[PDB]
C-alpha cells in the first residue's frame, strides 16, 4: 500500500534509555497491508519494525 | 470584675482560642509550604489522555 498526507506530532518526549519518545503520525493510505517503518536519521530508534 | 476583654475577643488576625488544652485556631498569618511526593500510579501519559 501507498500513503499520502502524512503528518507527525510528538506530544511527549523525554530523551532516556527507555522509549521516552512517542510519535503519533496521521496519514491516509490506499489499501490494507504491512508496512515497514525506518528512521533515516541515526539519532532516533523505533521499537516497532 | 475588672478583668477586661479576654484574648478570645482582643487577639488580632481573628485567632479563635479554645482550652482543655489551650490552643490558637485559624490565625491568618503568613503562608505555608507544602510538599507532595505523588506516586506514579496516579499519572497517565499524554498519549493515553
UniProtKB/Swiss-Prot annotation, chain A:
Source organism, top-level taxon: Viruses
PTM comment text: N-glycosylated.
Location(s) in or outside the cell: Virion membrane; Host cell membrane
Its membrane topology: Single-pass type I membrane protein
Subunit structure: Interacts with spike glycoprotein E2. The precursor of protein E3/E2 and E1 form a heterodimer shortly after synthesis. Processing of the precursor of protein E3/E2 into E2 and E3 results in a heterodimer of the spike glycoproteins E2 and E1. Spike at virion surface are constituted of three E2-E1 heterodimers. After target cell attachment and endocytosis, E1 change conformation to form homotrimers. Interacts with 6K protein. Interacts with host MXRA8; this interaction mediates virus entry. The interaction involves 2 adjacent E2-E1 heterodimers.
Functional description taken from the UniProt entry: Class II viral fusion protein. Fusion activity is inactive as long as E1 is bound to E2 in mature virion. After virus attachment to target cell via host MXRA8 and endocytosis, acidification of the endosome induce dissociation of E1/E2 heterodimer and concomitant trimerization of the E1 subunits. This E1 trimer is fusion active, and promotes release of viral nucleocapsid in cytoplasm after endosome and viral membrane fusion. Efficient fusion requires the presence of cholesterol and sphingolipid in the target membrane.
Name this polypeptide is given: Spike glycoprotein E1
Species in which this protein is naturally found: Chikungunya virus (strain 37997) (CHIKV)
Parent-record interval covered: 1103 to 1151 of 1248
